[PDB]
Design an enzyme around this catalytic site. Structure first.
Site, short mmCIF file in Angstrom:
data_model
loop_
_atom_site.label_atom_id
_atom_site.label_comp_id
_atom_site.label_asym_id
_atom_site.label_seq_id
_atom_site.Cartn_x
_atom_site.Cartn_y
_atom_site.Cartn_z
N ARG A 1 0.80 -1.22 0.00
CA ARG A 1 0.00 0.00 0.00
C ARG A 1 0.83 1.27 0.00
NH1 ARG A 1 1.60 3.21 4.45
NH2 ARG A 1 0.98 2.26 6.44
N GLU B 1 -7.34 7.06 7.64
CA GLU B 1 -6.25 7.76 8.29
C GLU B 1 -5.65 8.80 7.34
OE1 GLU B 1 -1.73 6.80 9.88
OE2 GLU B 1 -3.36 5.37 10.24
N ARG C 1 -5.53 5.75 0.55
CA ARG C 1 -4.59 4.64 0.62
C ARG C 1 -4.81 3.81 -0.63
NH1 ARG C 1 -2.93 3.18 5.77
NH2 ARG C 1 -2.29 5.05 6.93
N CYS D 1 0.36 10.48 9.74
CA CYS D 1 1.30 9.96 10.72
C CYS D 1 2.72 10.06 10.20
CB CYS D 1 0.97 8.50 11.07
SG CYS D 1 2.09 7.74 12.27
N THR E 1 5.06 8.09 10.63
CA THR E 1 5.55 6.78 10.23
C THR E 1 5.31 6.50 8.75
OG1 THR E 1 3.46 5.63 10.72
CG2 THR E 1 5.07 5.83 12.52
N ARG F 1 4.00 0.52 2.63
CA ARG F 1 4.07 -0.63 3.51
C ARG F 1 3.78 -1.87 2.70
NH1 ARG F 1 2.04 -3.93 7.69
NH2 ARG F 1 -0.21 -3.67 7.30
N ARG G 1 2.89 -7.37 12.87
CA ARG G 1 1.54 -7.02 13.28
C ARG G 1 0.65 -8.26 13.32
NH1 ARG G 1 0.04 -1.25 10.37
NH2 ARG G 1 2.06 -0.24 10.79
N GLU H 1 -2.33 -3.77 12.68
CA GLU H 1 -1.64 -3.28 13.87
C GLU H 1 -2.54 -3.30 15.10
OE1 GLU H 1 -0.36 0.73 13.46
OE2 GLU H 1 -2.40 1.50 13.21
#
Ligand SMILES: Nc1ncnc2c1ncn2[C@@H]1O[C@H](COP(=O)(O)OP(=O)(O)O)[C@@H](O)[C@H]1O
Ligand SMILES: CC(=N)NCCC[C@H](N)C(=O)O
Ligand SMILES: [Mg+2]
EC number: 2.7.3.3
Length: 356
Positions: free
Chosen positions: A125, A224, A228, A270, A272, A279, A308, A313
């Protein structure tokens, strides 16, 4: 920065110091000096340090604990973001800048588990933010609707393998939603870390998912991140998965303007997820290595990988199935990021075969 906000910050900092078993990067990097240096600062949209750290204060089990309410936040509150980003992404100095986008040579990627006894499915993703829109906590209900319209309209132009249908969360049946989440396709609803970051306001307005009929290509709208962009399928054919993602992202990029920063690469909510925003993960069984999820995580960490649970997660493994992925996203290319997962998973499988 008003007085009411300052009280909450001082109380939050105090709470973090007293939380003796808290292991978040927020606690680790929010020193008194750092805290005092930025606690009175405010962005043009009114984001304060509270809006940044609040999720980590309330959820002490956070791994990171902070979010950027708007792009300015990354610099306005730099003294907190900078050390955390450097820490998470395995080295990224103040003077460092994320490299230009580079998918790399897709033909150099291999099949991750030919005999099919370890890997269940493979997924890659990315995330993107629309230029002209701030991150979740600064969005209005109307903006959610505006963005949903723009993204869904853009994706209606996808063709061939990528052609598909947009399904709004509003009006979606509980049964349909729940199956999509269970089958690992749709983002879960009601995440406590996002909620306390004020990232889920007006839910489910503006939220939804686009996918092709085979559900190998998906786009999350307004979870989020604004988008995505996801490629996934059963098995270990990473090459195809990555190739499909590249095609999709390249096509969408020509149509929609996404936020990019000279230093941080593609911007995300985020820290991260900055940089490549990528990811790449597998769902994998490693019964010998996984005899203790902490031993598994310790093995994975040396390969720059994150472990995860089966539903994502903050979840447990079910039936011995773990989500293992590249941890780092910033300060390395897209190609380097996907290769870290490939290379790590290939060696872990070798270790599994050798393990007594
Ligand atoms: N390799 C994979 N194969 C199948 N489903 C996956 C894989 N990797 C992640 N998922 C699913 O993706 C969904 C989102 O999980 P999260 O851990 O939130 O990842 P993201 O970076 O996609 O937000 C979860 O349902 C999880 O099961
Ligand atoms: C989805 C995501 N950004 N995960 C990384 C950090 C999540 C959570 N705020 C934490 O600090 O554990
Ligand atoms: Mg997520």
């Amino acid at each position: 920065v008003d007085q009411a906000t300052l009280d909450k910050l001082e109380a939050g900092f105090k709470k973090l110091q007293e939380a003796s078993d808290c292991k978040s990067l927020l606690k680790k990097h929010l020193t008194k000096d750092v805290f005092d240096s930025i606690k009175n600062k405010k962005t043009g949209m009114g984001a304060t340090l509270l809006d940044v750290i609040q999720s980590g204060v309330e959820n002490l089990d956070s791994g990171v604990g902070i979010y950027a309410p708007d792009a300015e936040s990354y610099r306005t509150f730099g003294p907190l973001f900078d050390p955390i980003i450097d820490d998470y992404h395995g080295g990224f100095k103040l003077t460092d800048k994320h490299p230009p986008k580079q998918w790399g040579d897709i033909n150099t990627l291999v099949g991750l588990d030919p005999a099919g006894q370890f890997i269940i499915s493979t997924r890659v993703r990315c995330g993107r933010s629309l230029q002209g829109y701030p991150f979740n906590p600064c969005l209005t209900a109307e903006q959610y609707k505006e963005m949903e319209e723009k993204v869904s309209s853009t994706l209606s132009s996808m063709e061939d393998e990528l052609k598909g249908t947009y399904y709004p969360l509003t009006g979606m049946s509980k049964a349909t939603q729940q199956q999509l989440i269970d089958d690992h396709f749709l983002f879960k609803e009601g995440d406590r870390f996002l909620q306390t970051a004020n990232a889920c306001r007006y839910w489910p307005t503006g939220r939804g998912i686009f996918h092709n009929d085979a559900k190998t290509f998906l786009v999350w709208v307004n979870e989020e991140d604004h988008l995505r962009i996801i490629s996934m399928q059963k098995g270990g054919d990473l090459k195809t998965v990555y190739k499909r993602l590249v095609t999709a992202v390249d096509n969408i990029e020509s149509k929609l303007p996404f936020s990019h920063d000279d230093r941080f690469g593609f911007l995300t909510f985020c820290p991260t997820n900055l940089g490549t925003t990528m990811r790449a993960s597998v769902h994998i069984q490693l019964p010998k290595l996984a005899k203790d999820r902490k031993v598994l995580e310790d093995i994975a960490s040396k390969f720059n990988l994150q472990v995860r649970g089966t539903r994502g997660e903050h979840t447990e493994s079910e039936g011995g199935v773990y989500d293992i992925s590249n941890k780092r996203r910033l300060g390395l290319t897209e190609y380097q990021a996907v290769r870290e997962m490939q290379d790590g998973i290939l060696e872990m499988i070798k270790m599994e075969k050798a393990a007594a």
